[PDB]
């Protein structure tokens, strides 16, 4: 399987900073096929970005997704205090579907 | 006394090597979010607040364009007369119209045991030629609409951009960048461009697309003059919106379609201006 | 050749006899606050025929704009004076592509769909003249109460919702003479070249063209276009693309600027002082 | 001095015996996947997935052509019959009139639903087999065994890929979903087609026998007809019929051609 | 050396009383199947199989024919040449009647429009229409009454080159049966639309102004063999919609005026 590694380990930061958050993997990701996932205490995951860099249904424009190939990059342009949860990338260019380890996010 | 693109213009050139014909496949730009569904915008959001609307840079179709260099045709640049090249007509069509006869891809079942969805709704179909880049005005529907990094959109927008806001002036000089919803060719310009555009809005509007080589659009104005190339240079210029595809889900998606360009050329005599 | 109670002579050809005039049209949608600038109001409905009270900022309204030309005539006593000739109009509705904006505040035309697009009614109409355009009135229901700010068929009658000779106006107001209320008059506007499409229906899809290719003719049968009276030329304009439709299914009409550019030339006229 | 299709075109031949006609009925190739439903496309399958998106083969409309062989030519110059007019319709319209074999009833008590839908009607008369150009809407349909499609496919191929270049040289292969005539080529061909698509277009077609279409180019010259064959294409797709169960089928129509000829003569 | 229809044509005769107009109100054949309703088909039938379809003759519409007599004429023969035509379709207005029998358009509504198919043809000619045979389904039995493609098979259902007609009987060949051949009808100008739909909108224009010219490319207009005129018709205007939902065809007559001139002419 593809496996996914995501750095840093935790993330602290103030409210309005940029998060950069990455997500790097094994092999080559087929069709740019990685999404990023939020996942607040006691909620299932919360799709932010497919296909690399699509933003889907609903979800706030300071959030964004860039890379191709095995190196992904997810940003929050200006952190909000619901913003200081855990994240987590999805390839789903090879079978099976593979998540990174998560990446949390903490108010410095 | 013809003026042409602040140019003198004299008469039609008649020699055996006086014609040139030039052709290009321009490729529509209707988002690409995803590199297998090439042609394709993102699906559509719907019901943003006018306060808040904010759309994804690949869910917005661009106008394509292309610069086609031409042959020099001057040996010397201080001779009493000089040669340009005349745009004197074009012959276009949208090209893949029948690929729109596969309703066994993706698309939604018109009732239960149908067929998909055949592609319909807004569409929008518009070609340039020109010896200059398109000269383009500003035109939202919403004027506080958040446009993403990676396009070029009405810069200061206000409640007059919704209407007429004569600030909204931009040359078509940039692929994949110039959002179809936010500009239209500006009739107060484009004095040696020649521009067609037909837009069909609805929810359920069918595609008619007619394709010919027996089909000729004459670029010559009232005076008979063409285009002239300036820095031998032709200016093509495309938007062709076929309508909506609509998913299983009932998510939709723009798909667009390439357009030739066959355009007919001739040497002009005009008067040096240096 | 008598046209507009002066004597036409021949064309002036000269250098400087042709000139082009030029000016973008904004709508008249009702723009019921600053920020829905090109839209009306929502529209009320089922008003009983009694007790129809329209918003002024639900009523579209006719644009006009007068356009000063330069003086021609060195003096106004000269046996032959020259005044502009309207000869050709190329006008397109400026912004058609705006309609491509499916994500802002337009209902889903099904779960997960994209906004509906702006459809349903649409009025297309435009006037080059020498004069103010002439109006006739015609109403859907002669006791409808219009709302202070705007010029309605004064006295209406039930002979107003079919033809009443009384309802004549200038459109001599931008802004004030409501589309519902008025059509170009075709018993006068002897000075005015007129042209209107109306395409009614709950589900109509606007159909429009832009082409800088594309030019009207002005001149009449006698081969006379528009004579600009006091070096004034008169641009009028309605243009409803249709009923844009919001989330709760309320809907706004919207509209577009209409671009003109008018070739003028020099016309000899007979001195009637 | 006039090269087309890499020949110099020189004066008409006149007299009574210069001129000729041809004629053919092109039958239509919508699948016919059923003995008894010639004319007919399988039912259409519907929501394949991009990534497993697998055609049955008489569910696919195809090009029509056929080669007319004209009278031998060949005296000082070669001769080429020139293809001056055509007159064309599309042949049996008002059988779509019969809503009583097999279309579901438009609403209780009703008569049969009417053929509509998107619908397809072209024509092409050459000197050469029609070149068409490949445009898919989906670059990673496995197409069937017995039809002719854009070999190795990109995502490119969804918009304008030049690789995809074919001549319609044979019958009931090349599918309509697949291939446009190419106006980059077709130097020795005339073709028109229009597309209407969406769920309820109506079909709209003429039948008159005063109409005819001119085939001569800009400089007067029509389809030079190469080792005396002339080239007949057509796709009459009229839209679809509805089944009881709401089961859709394409139904195709044969379009008639009657093209005047001249006799041409040409030079190496 | 000019032939049109085995007939070597001369010069048009310029004599005072060398031009006639004839005229017809050509009745539409729908099928007509109670003595009531006159210009309407029995009601449609729906969802018949393939192998068991049997429609009723009266639910068939027919093209409509007539042959006009002309005055007899016979230094060379003279034929009647026919020039132009001046046709509408008769009645139009008679569609603005939705209180008999109509299906209300929904609760308190007015009686639904005619309207769906429709197929407005008509020819002229100095011998009878030739037409081709098309079947929707070549197994459809036919009722008696009518003359349909014979010893149909599958082929049929596309181009069958066996099924060759004269329209030389009214009320008897049915309009989904056949067209007019374009291969053959040498001597007639037809002209046809067929629009199909379930809600496609009937528009019919009339106008005492327009004239269709029958000339072909030589200037020859059809030649009346045996002093007569053929006229021929289809005018299925939609589908008429009964408070049950049932639907019937809605046919109108055709009016023809045709302008006849002497031209001389050699065997
Ligand atoms: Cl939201
Ligand atoms: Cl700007
Ligand atoms: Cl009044
Ligand atoms: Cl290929
Ligand atoms: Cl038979």
């Known amino acids: ?108 | 006394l013809l003026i042409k693109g602040g140019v003198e213009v004299l008469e039609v050139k008649t020699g055996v090597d006086a014609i040139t014909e030039v052709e290009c496949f321009l490729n529509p730009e209707m988002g690409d979010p995803d590199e297998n569904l090439r042609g394709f915008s993102l699906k559509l959001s719907a019901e943003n607040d006018f306060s808040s609307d904010s759309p994804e840079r690949k869910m917005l179709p661009c106008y394509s364009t292309a610069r086609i260099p031409l042959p020099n045709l001057n040996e010397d640049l201080t001779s009493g007369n000089l040669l340009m090249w005349e745009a004197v007509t074009v012959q276009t069509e949208v090209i893949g119209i029948t690929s729109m006869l596969n309703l066994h891809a993706g698309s939604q079942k018109v009732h239960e045991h149908g067929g998909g969805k055949p592609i319909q709704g807004s569409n929008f179909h518009f070609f340039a030629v020109g010896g200059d880049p398109l000269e383009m005005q500003g035109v939202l529907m919403n004027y506080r609409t958040k446009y993403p990094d990676g396009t070029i959109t009405p810069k200061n927008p206000t409640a007059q951009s919704q209407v007429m806001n004569t600030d909204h002036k931009a040359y078509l000089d940039k692929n994949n960048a110039y959002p179809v919803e936010c500009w239209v060719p500006d009739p107060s310009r484009n004095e040696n461009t020649r521009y067609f555009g037909t837009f069909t809005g609805g929810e359920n509007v069918p595609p008619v697309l007619h394709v010919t080589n027996t089909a000729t659009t004459v670029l010559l104005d009232e005076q008979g003059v063409g285009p002239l190339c300036k820095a031998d240079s032709l200016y093509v210029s495309a938007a062709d919106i076929c309508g909506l595809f609509t998913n299983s889900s009932g998510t939709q998606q723009w798909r667009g379609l390439a357009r030739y360009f066959k355009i007919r050329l001739r040497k002009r005599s005009v008067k040096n201006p240096y």
Request: aromatic share 10%; with cysteine; charged share 15%.
């Open chain 1, 1 to 108: 399987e593809i496996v996914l590694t995501q750095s840093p380990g935790t993330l602290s930061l103030s409210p309005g900073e940029r998060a950069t958050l990455s997500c790097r993997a094994s092999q080559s990701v087929s069709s740019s096929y990685l999404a990023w996932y939020q996942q607040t205490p006691g909620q299932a995951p919360r799709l932010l970005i497919y296909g690399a860099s699509s933003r889907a249904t609903g979800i706030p424009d300071r959030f964004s997704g860039s890379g191709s190939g095995t190196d992904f990059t997810l940003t929050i342009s200006r952190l909000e205090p619901e913003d200081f949860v855990v994240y987590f990338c999805l390839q789903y260019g090879s079978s099976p579907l593979t998540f990174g380890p998560g990446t949390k996010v903490d108010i410095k």
